[model samples]
Target: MAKPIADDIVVRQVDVGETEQLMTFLLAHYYPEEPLTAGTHPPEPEAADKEFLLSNVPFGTCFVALHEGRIVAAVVAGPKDSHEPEHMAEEARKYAGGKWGSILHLLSAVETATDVCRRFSVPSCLHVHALGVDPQLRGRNLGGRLMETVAQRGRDLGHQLVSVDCTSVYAARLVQRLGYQLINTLRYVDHLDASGQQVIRPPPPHESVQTFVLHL
Candidate 1:
């Protein structure tokens, strides 16, 4: 078993009403360290960013950890249809010239590279889109606690599978330790555009993006 978490920290499903605080917290604490969007996202959260994170709240699988009522860690997950890759890719093309273009395309490529639904033989799966911990509270295992909660939630909701696309090496390690098996990996340099150009290149320690899955 993992080490016991601190007594003051509270872990729970994030409510729809808390989306704004969650979005701001994630943008400030999470995205900045996220490999793909590390230096790519704008200085402040954009409208598209708000739209993207807000959409996941309604899933009821998203979770958060709080210290004195302030969000310190978060995990955003949702039911992803078998057709998610294609649909996301199509959406990427529509925003091909926008600020979040390459990031979207790269994520789409990651999902397409390994179709979790087909491999797991499930109609759909719970896909964790993002996970982050407060920079000040980094070594506390808060992220893993939230991940465990989400996995149990997935099982309780009748999902036979739970998948996460890990773009950061740290995230990959966290999920793997929780029993998620690596499915496939897509190196950042290898993700390219139509003209054989690199789409997004992240720094060291985040050389590749990987897909991990756990069977419930």
Candidate 2:
């Protein structure tokens, strides 16, 4: 919990000035491997995703992992209210015809269904929006460390819980290992669009969207 210290890696709260660099880092290292985003279409920067991640930066709950002063990993997190579910569902409906329609629909559906804040009778919790490690650094424990740091950050910010919507199998596993409890799961195969077709079929190993919560 003490900053996930390593000899070379420095874990620090993300600063407002580093927004551009953070966006660039996520666009390259995070989006491509995120099954929901990647499987929806080709991996390119999406304005909605960028906006969401960037918004988390100023919350002081987000963090970046640095080695030699360059980002190697990052986590986007923020305080989430119980009303966010309806808000996201409304936005999803508003953007149903837009480029991120399916993506938004998927996210909104999961969050609304899980509704961790409501389920736990809490007004809000620290929600982890995204996590990414430089592609070259996977399996080096950077991802785990960053996650641990975020949970600690959440507690420091006076939150009693932390939640994450895990869309990737790997991410689900990572969080489970870190002691997050599974609250709900929605298999991609079971989700259908209005046309009755499976919506956003991410490749194998990304079979479902799961919500997890860790009590701080």
Candidate 3:
């Protein structure tokens, strides 16, 4: 019988470069399996997009869970930015050749999330950009601990809502269980690849990127 690893998770606000690393790690390792399929493209990272996201870290808060100094989970959030919509579209355009269908899905998800944030009068609320647990680190409560840490920080900042979008049903359900509410759904279509030979299959419906108001 295998012995259970003692939980020694530490959740904290990561510095700029560290946050970028977390984003890269999660996208590279997990986003492909993400259900929405919008943001998955070229199945690889683009230097320009990665730099843009990393450079913008001065504007947001990112948290990570370290177990024995290894980051196993992470979440990023902060005041929503107006540039996110344009950024998403640009990424789609740049990476669309072999991934038009996925690109379209990415655009809709970004647009819908932006619109909801604007509509709720939460222009300044915490906006969660990404969250994931390392595959090898699953079955631990690390994800929940990371979330709780972020939520507490949002409350401390005097913010009323914490919002996020998920490409995975599991992610949506987990956040909902933590008190988020479904806000809305968005959809779009595109070709599967450059050959234009493959028929476009509608990307799976994305989970409602939601927001939860913190209780005072």
Candidate 4:
């Protein structure tokens, strides 16, 4: 059985340098089942990629959750222009040398979805990326608290809406419970191996993705 996180866990905005550590912890502990399509690059490679991505992030946005002085969960929320393009470019460059066909597909899907949101006049919305909780901490309500912190922060930052693009059923459920509404659905196509073989996976069937606007 897994131990539950302590109730005194704290959440706060983390520095960009610390964000990289959080990302590493997330990919290793929580997202190992899905795995990074770009494979296990070294810390330097990962830091370079993260730096490029964070370079474009809008000001006053980025967060992490800690328990017992160790980061256990993290969520990044910011304006749309924050780091997404640079992030995509970095991802493209990283996966381009590989045989992963799904990389391009995933990037395209993100671009299309972002465009749709932009076209809908959601330019200043708060966007959530990379919400992750430690696997050992799963089912302990820590994830929900982390999300609530983000939402409250978004509201404090004067955002009219809070949005997230999730591919996991667990995430979808948690977000919906946090008062996010399902407004759209998207299909992400990718490759399983480095051989360019294609595979189509739907973003969480129950809650694919949608802009959840909190009118504050």
Candidate 5:
């Protein structure tokens, strides 16, 4: 399927030069306080978000939904093999610090979930590392469109599967509605906090850390 054209929103690939805008958009709209991330570790501060961006931006595998000329939503994806255990451990060392140390543990869950597919012989597939939409634009379904576009483009690029570790309820639902198969689900409740208590208190309907895979 060809990419769609719309005056209300535009979706396409972005280069590394746009990393600043991506980071800006994320900092303004998306935050680390969301339940999933909060439960996993701590709020994403400068060091954490910047580190995440530096790790991903160079992949040059970015897509965004622009509304009113700025990026209202975006998705960052890249090759999976590069985000293995050792790599993530290094990321934990470089990013999460002091009070945010547990954030690394949260980040590790992403690897565990995405690794499920590779364990089953799914190789060379693209993995969506992050997806965010402006809070004000939540009901417009732009998130769905952005993901659909990425899936189609991923297929055209000779990729057969596109996986994402849906750490949030809304994200998991969107991925599931988009026809992705749920391969793994890790409950935040299952993981204890520093105090050895259930850190995650899901709002509603969202059960756990869901990893969904779309087979192109």
Candidate 6:
């Protein structure tokens, strides 16, 4: 897992032909402490919950980080419209299973807090739904590179705004460094389930679910 040569680290549009494999990299390399994978969320990124991203790769909002021609990180983005929350939250519920109902609550809160569809006022905007870097390569800045490219891609496609739900603390920090402004936050411990229990605890430094936006 040595760092690749500077010239060897490449960022590019994801080939839908290789998207399935890229997604496999995302799931397999997903942090053990990320919200979705944090305690016992699943066999790790259950498919039904992520079909929005998976199915929409064909829509041209996905990208990957390659080192020596091997994918070490991947990000999935798609249009965020007012209609996205309702159906996608239910889909996340079904995929996460019964013990994880709070997952749905978190998802709903993101759409409500950000309100990207209504606030952006353009019918839709680019939304970074998921991002992951290989565990062995976390400190190498691949996450930032992927995001930098994605933000520009949104602009290239004529978008006025780009948004992301930063469920992980590190992801939140990444967006801040990339010049995205914070709009909302929902912390896991503060989000109690009906039983008065904490819904989830994020890894260190990731105190809350933060929504960040970059106006292109």
Which structure among the candidates has the greatest TM-score? 2
Q: lDDT tens digits, residues 1-216, model 5? A: 124545577786767676778878876776553455545434554465556654665665678887666888888777665347567767656654443445556657557555744565655677787788888788777778888877876787777788887777888888878888988777766865557766555444656778888888
Which residue runs does candidate 4 get wrong by more than 4 Å?
A: 1-6, 34-49, 52-58, 81-104, 114-119, 189-216
TM-score of each: 0.93, 0.94, 0.68, 0.68, 0.80, 0.84
lDDT of model number 4: 0.56
Flag clash pairs in model 5. none
lDDT of 2 by residue, 1-216 (tens): 126466688888888887888888888899888877777764574687678779887788778888887888999998888899999999899778654778889889988898888799887899888999997788877878988888888878888889998988889989889989999999998998898987777778888888899999
Q: Write down the lDDT of every candidate, Cα atoms only.
A: 0.82, 0.84, 0.57, 0.56, 0.69, 0.73
Candidates arranged by lDDT, highest first: 2, 1, 6, 5, 3, 4
Ranking by TM-score: 2, 1, 6, 5, 3, 4
Q: Where does candidate 3 clash, by residue pair?
A: 38-106
Candidate 4 residue lDDT tens string, 63-101: 666777688776666665444555555666565643232
RMSD of 2: 1.8
Candidate 6 global TM-score: 0.84
Error of 4 at 159 (Å): 2.1
List of clashing residue pairs for candidate 4: 56-83
Model 6, poorest ten-residue lDDT window?
A: 39-48
The residue pairs that clash in candidate 1, if any, are none
- Once model 6 is optimally superposed onto the true structure by TM-score, how far is the C-alpha of residue 52 displaced, in angstroms? 3.6
What is the per-residue lDDT of model 3 for residues 175-211, given as tens digits with 9 covering 90 to 100? Answer: 7777777764443233234455432232455433333
- Candidate 3 to truth, TM: 0.68
Error of 4 at 6 (Å): 6.0
